Symmetry: C5
Amino acid sequence: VSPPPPIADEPLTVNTGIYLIECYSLDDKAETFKVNAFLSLSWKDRRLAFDPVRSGVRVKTYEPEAIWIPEIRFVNVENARDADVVDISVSPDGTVQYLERFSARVLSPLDFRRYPFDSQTLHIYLIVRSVDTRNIVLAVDLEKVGKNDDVFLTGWDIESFTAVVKPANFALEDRLESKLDYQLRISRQYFSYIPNIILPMLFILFISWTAFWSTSYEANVTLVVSTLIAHIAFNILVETNLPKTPYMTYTGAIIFMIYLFYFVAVIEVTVQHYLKVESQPARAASITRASRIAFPVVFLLANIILAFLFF
Amino acid sequence: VSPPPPIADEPLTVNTGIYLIECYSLDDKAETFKVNAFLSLSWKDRRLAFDPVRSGVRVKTYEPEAIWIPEIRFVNVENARDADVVDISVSPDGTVQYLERFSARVLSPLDFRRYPFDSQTLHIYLIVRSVDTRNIVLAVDLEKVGKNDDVFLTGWDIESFTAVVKPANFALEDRLESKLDYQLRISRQYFSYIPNIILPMLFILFISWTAFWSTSYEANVTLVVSTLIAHIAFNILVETNLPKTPYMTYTGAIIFMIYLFYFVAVIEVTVQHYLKVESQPARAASITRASRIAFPVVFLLANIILAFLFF
Amino acid sequence: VSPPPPIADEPLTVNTGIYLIECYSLDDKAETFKVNAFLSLSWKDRRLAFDPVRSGVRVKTYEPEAIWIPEIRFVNVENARDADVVDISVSPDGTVQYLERFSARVLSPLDFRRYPFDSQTLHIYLIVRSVDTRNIVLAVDLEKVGKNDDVFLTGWDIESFTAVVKPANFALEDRLESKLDYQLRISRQYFSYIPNIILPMLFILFISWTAFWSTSYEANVTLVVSTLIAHIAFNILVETNLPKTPYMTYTGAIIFMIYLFYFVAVIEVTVQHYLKVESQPARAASITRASRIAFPVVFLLANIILAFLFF
Amino acid sequence: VSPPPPIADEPLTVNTGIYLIECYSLDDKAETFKVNAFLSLSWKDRRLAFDPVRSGVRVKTYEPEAIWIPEIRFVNVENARDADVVDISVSPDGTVQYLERFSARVLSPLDFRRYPFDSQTLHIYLIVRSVDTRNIVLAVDLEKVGKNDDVFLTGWDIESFTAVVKPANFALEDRLESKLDYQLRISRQYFSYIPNIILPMLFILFISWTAFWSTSYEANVTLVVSTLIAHIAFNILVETNLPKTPYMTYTGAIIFMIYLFYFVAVIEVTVQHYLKVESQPARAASITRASRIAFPVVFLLANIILAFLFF
Amino acid sequence: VSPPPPIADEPLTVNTGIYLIECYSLDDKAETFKVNAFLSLSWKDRRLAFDPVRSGVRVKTYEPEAIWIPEIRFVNVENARDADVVDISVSPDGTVQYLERFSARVLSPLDFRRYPFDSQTLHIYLIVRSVDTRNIVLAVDLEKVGKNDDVFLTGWDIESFTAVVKPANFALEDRLESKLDYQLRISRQYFSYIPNIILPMLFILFISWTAFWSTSYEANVTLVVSTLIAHIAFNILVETNLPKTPYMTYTGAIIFMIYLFYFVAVIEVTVQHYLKVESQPARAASITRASRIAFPVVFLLANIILAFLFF
Ligand SMILES: [Cl-]
Ligand SMILES: [Cl-]
Ligand SMILES: [Cl-]
Ligand SMILES: [Cl-]
Ligand SMILES: [Cl-]
Ligand SMILES: [Cl-]
Ligand SMILES: [Cl-]
Ligand code: NA
Ligand code: NA
Ligand code: NA
Ligand code: NA
Ligand code: NA
Ligand code: NA
């Protein structure tokens, strides 16, 4: 088999569509997601044309090996897609309608800057390479792009699944390549982060601030050091759910800042004890009373600054 | 091979059945389960009809390649099922009996709202896409739906395996699609959660309440902060066995609420110490004595409220 | 190819044997084990019979495709076995000798009631489904059942590998099915649990009891709470190596009971401090002295009761 | 099929190229990385030459089975590459142009000495084994070596992808072997290590040094021991992201050194308490005051020495 | 295809060789290692004899399916090897030279008694089963046994790769089997265990001994209990890298013994406090002073005894 011959000098247009059946396993650390979908292909092959009257058939079915089929690949996949051909239908003018169901693990970078209040645009890049005989170009049949209503991605909200209609045509290894960008827009369900990480982390921080209403150094050291350790546990927990980024994430920024608050609280607790031992408690009392206001105020303002820089 | 031709205009009815052999790996985080089962298919193909008197044979056995077989797929699977054909039998009137043994990893959402006292309905969706020549519709042969007595799903009780007899017929990418819903009803074995998570979590909480019978601030801080850390460990342990949900689970609610009790216990311990330092112990004594009753009472009532909202 | 025809009305007897080459990966949480073995099959096929004199051979070697071979399956496997045919040999009277080497992941429930002093019976269920043409029944050739001397299952002692000689014949979807039960008896190597979990867990408990020889409330609180946290760590460690069971395991029972001992030790430490503060130390001394005997005595008796109930 | 015959006595030159499409999963512990790339091959097969004016066709497209193709393998792969042939083109003179898209998991040792400020040279070794008929030698077509602009390796910066043009020709098992070295130069994005591991580890260390401004032994013991435990947690966290090395890494050296600082701080806190109990506080005061300067000074100098030895 | 016929009555000798290309993933817990190697095979099949004059060629190249190939298997593999035939060369007398490149996960028991200062002998067992027509025996061609210079097993030193030249010929299921033992001798790189586990574990132990220079019970309890918890963390860390053994490992013995030292240190700290409360500090001072010498001395002697018993 060889590619369909051009009537004039035109490129062969392969119309495409992706219909999502299942979306699962969005792995943040790996920056991958698994997909199960229909891939539809359509092109004209004059050599397969027929007259309906003398044939007695309005449509003709073929086996993949019997006819020429464009070698369509995904750019951003781990391994080649697992595909099973569903149907190959030919109309009288030789218009081929190809349908396959596939499953693939897709590599798509994620922007963690606003985590866990982030949104992402996942990409599925469709590609075809041209042959010596002719140039093969991809197109989007919008009527064949979509997703099942039941498509759920655990921990995410699916906003839209659209295709950038104009392909990116370019040369690769001295042959032209036609690339389409299918975009799946998603937004993270931040809900669970509030009772599981955010609030517990705030509670332990506020508990360390009770040391500003205590003159007991031994108790103060216990309050600040114990809560700091619990903060380290949350920092470790958060970083296990995320890849290493060359930038600060919103959560990472807050987590990092909270260490400064623990560090300054230890200085305050030390200064307070030192003065009381040096028979200067009036003074230590001034520092402690100021700290009761300063710590929550600086915490609020620093958070407003951070939220502003990130959102 | 091509589909059996219609006598009139009727759709081809493919009778189905699923008989569960093994159920394993119900993964809560992934919202998947693995299944090993028999898939039974039955349809009439008049082209295969024969005379039983002259043939002397009641049944003819065919190889899958020799005859036309409907392309039956599962909607909610990770990858296409791993199937092995067991038997193909044809009756004299041309009724085909197909039997395969398959294994598949099934995607089925779980409702964690009542965890670990939850029940689930797992789904296995069977599907067929109509061909250009004719419309294919699915039916349930109840005589071929079931499960082996030894079918065990570790940590769950299997209640029933039934099929919704009426298929969901709909158009998808300009063809008809016939979908059947096989339902596996299961209930979680909550037993182990009691001695492993629930009771240990209650013991540490009650231990924090012994601070209401102590005037030692240093010991009190140690009691409340140490048990709080142990509570954080249980919170982390619980969240590792569960996916992130856009809602509160029953366990999540209790775990979250317990933080409030630790937070208020720290305030009480602080207030008590502050008053004793300020030479107001009679007052501190009133707050501490009230706390001895208030803490267990509010804990009981808050739990009754939560159990009511969730069950 | 079709099954051997019956001389009278007899079912076809397929003689079986399993010879274990390798046993590995007994996964307690998954309740699976991996096996690498020889599967031997033998049956009479008269159509294959030959005269040794005429043919000039005493044995005939065929390829699997050339002759009829029974469709033998394993019931309790995750996926169908990975098998490679080693030999097919036909004797002059049509006695077929089939040999394959296979590997499979087997599902076999485990009873954790006596963990880590437990013994198990792993099962490998061989099955055959009858054909329209004839009924197929399985038998055990004891001369072909065994295991390599070097077969080792990490963390277990292999006791025996035997087969229940009488098959379980039953109807499944109006066809006879013949099931054989191959049993691998194993006993857990409990050794390492003693220095790694049991003794460390007892040491920390005994350390909590030193609080019965101390009047220092602050030190007592530190002793009991710190050791309780270490006990929580061991509880978590143990539960990670085990699946969730709808029953109490021996270790689970001891682990759970030890919490009660920590809880009562906290009450004692609290009561002691409360009385001393209330200027009643003579009394507190009576409770503390009683506790020094009561705690180890009740611990020993409770352990004798538990060991009795479990063994 | 057999290899192309030599015109004189020359070895067959197979021109190669690797074009990276995707780079993912650089696993530090496993010392592996996954790659998805184009592999291009070119050689002269005179038996395939044709006339350009007579034939009318400028290029002939063959199926892999139709022609002789050199058996090209990767040395440093876990399993054989997953490959799909994209195109085979023959020019009039018989120059074959082969193109495949492959995916592979590559074993490539990493030097962790400067971790997390390390750079690596990943290798992809291409190999060909000569045949009895003739010797096969590899060459690099630099026009066919490259990488997609979008190639991202999470947590790393990709510097260059080049090939050592001169193959390593050697005898192995009495036949010639021709090996090419493709080099992917990468540098680790150390950014995230600063707020996640480095700074938290420095903060806890500085917190231990507040014990040099405290006379309270009980508080000092709590400060030094608690922070040491947090240091152990960071040591464990770091070692989980790294394989075991027969050398010290930069981070490993710092982590190890910090233990010495905790050890000496415990000695100081002990010495201070001992002297105060012995009614020698003037002296304990001299040791404590010296420690306030000595600890940060020795820490700075030891770090300058370490950075010098490692960079 | 059938086996080559014997000239007299001798068994067919299949000469073997294994050349290691890659060694990776030595998994201590699983007692497995992955291997990528060349498997060379050589046997005489006179039925393949040819005249170079008539056929033109001096050596014939065959496809595996075209000729008889001995069914060579590995005994100790999880699944059947992933193999790809590199060459099948037949010389005029009928001597076959077979070369395949394979990858396999090998089961090989490990002796952890001296861990992490242990050495191992990994085995790769090659096997052939005899057929009816004739007996097959294996031999080692030493010229074809070896390893690539670049072969590295992360965390191990490779000493030698040799074969036991004499096969183990034995009967199995009424047929002969010929088994060869390929041995890979390795020694563990213990380096990293010193700064990561050994020294940190010794530092925390020595820190607990500072309690012998302190009269503060509350500080002593904190010193001994905190370091004990850190010791538990190291015990857990070590046991995660190792399988459960029915014997004591060297590290396991030291780790276990250190618990006894913590237990006795708690007794000492308790005894000291008890006597001081009972107004007997002179005596308490004698016990504490003795402990300062006894603890390090008994620790040194117990380690000399253990090192002696293990090495
Ligand atoms: Cl693809
Ligand atoms: Cl499917
Ligand atoms: Cl099976
Ligand atoms: Cl029955
Ligand atoms: Cl029957
Ligand atoms: Cl390869
Ligand atoms: Cl093998
Ligand atoms: Na084609
Ligand atoms: Na068919
Ligand atoms: Na057969
Ligand atoms: Na070829
Ligand atoms: Na304390
Ligand atoms: Na063969």
